[PDB]
Design a protein around this ligand. Structure first.
Ligand code: ZN
Ligand code: ZN
Lengths: 137, 5, 136, 5
């Protein structure tokens, strides 16, 4: 399958959890995170960072008795992947294409929502600098 | 667990 | 956006391949109907009306306007699993689809293999002939 | 039609 679509497959998603700290004895294992749609996106700063592949919600701060599904419902109730009940292979191509369109939309929405935030931050700085000149300063 | 920042 | 490898599974792609197809309105083997039957247009300098099943890779030239592309496909490549496929592309399950693409990859390899055999037999023919001539 | 020959 093309790389673009691999995140739709659980075994791919599991394979992302390279150094996941929570393992057996825990509620949020790699298996269970992946069943819930998450992938592992670690960084230097947020080493337990995980992201829904579908709605792109990013969650860190994971505790061991967290149920990844219950967490995904709480933090991103809108996510259509939570509605999906059939296994990947039991999907029709129509249904699958419908979903991938919804994912592309979510992705765009997220990128858009970031740009707005960066911009609003930049505007704040510019405004401030101008206010400071107007102070006679 | 909690959102990014 | 489906990867280019899988585009041929879509009828509207297949239709789009018939850039300078001669048989159009009035005719039984229109681009629409060739494509509904699984063909793509693979013209050449030498075989300008050449068409190929995307699935079983059968290549058919010699098209006449009254030809029903489906009936021609059944006749020339009855083995083709694409002919079994009743459902529309989007009504297929992913299991069913993946099953098919695995069969296409098999057919492709079989076809590649069948070409190599032919080239070899062709080269053998030449070598034979050259040796016969030198025996003289 | 007929097979590529
Ligand atoms: Zn989600
Ligand atoms: Zn065929």
């Amino acid at each position: 399958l093309p790389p673009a679509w691999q995140p739709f497959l659980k075994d791919h998603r599991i394979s992302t959890f390279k150094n996941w700290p929570f393992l057996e004895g825990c509620a949020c294992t790699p298996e269970r995170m992946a069943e819930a749609g998450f992938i592992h996106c670690p960084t230097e700063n947020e080493p337990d960072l995980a992201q829904c592949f579908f709605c792109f919600k990013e969650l860190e701060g994971w505790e061991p008795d967290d149920d990844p599904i219950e967490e995904h419902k709480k933090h991103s109730s809108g996510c259509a992947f939570l509605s999906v009940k059939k296994q990947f292979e039991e999907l029709t191509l129509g249904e699958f294409l419908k979903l991938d369109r919804e994912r592309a939309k979510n992705k765009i929405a997220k990128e858009t929502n970031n740009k707005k935030k960066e911009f609003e931050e930049t505007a704040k700085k510019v405004r401030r600098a101008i206010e400071q000149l107007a102070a006679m300063d | 667990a909690r959102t990014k920042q």
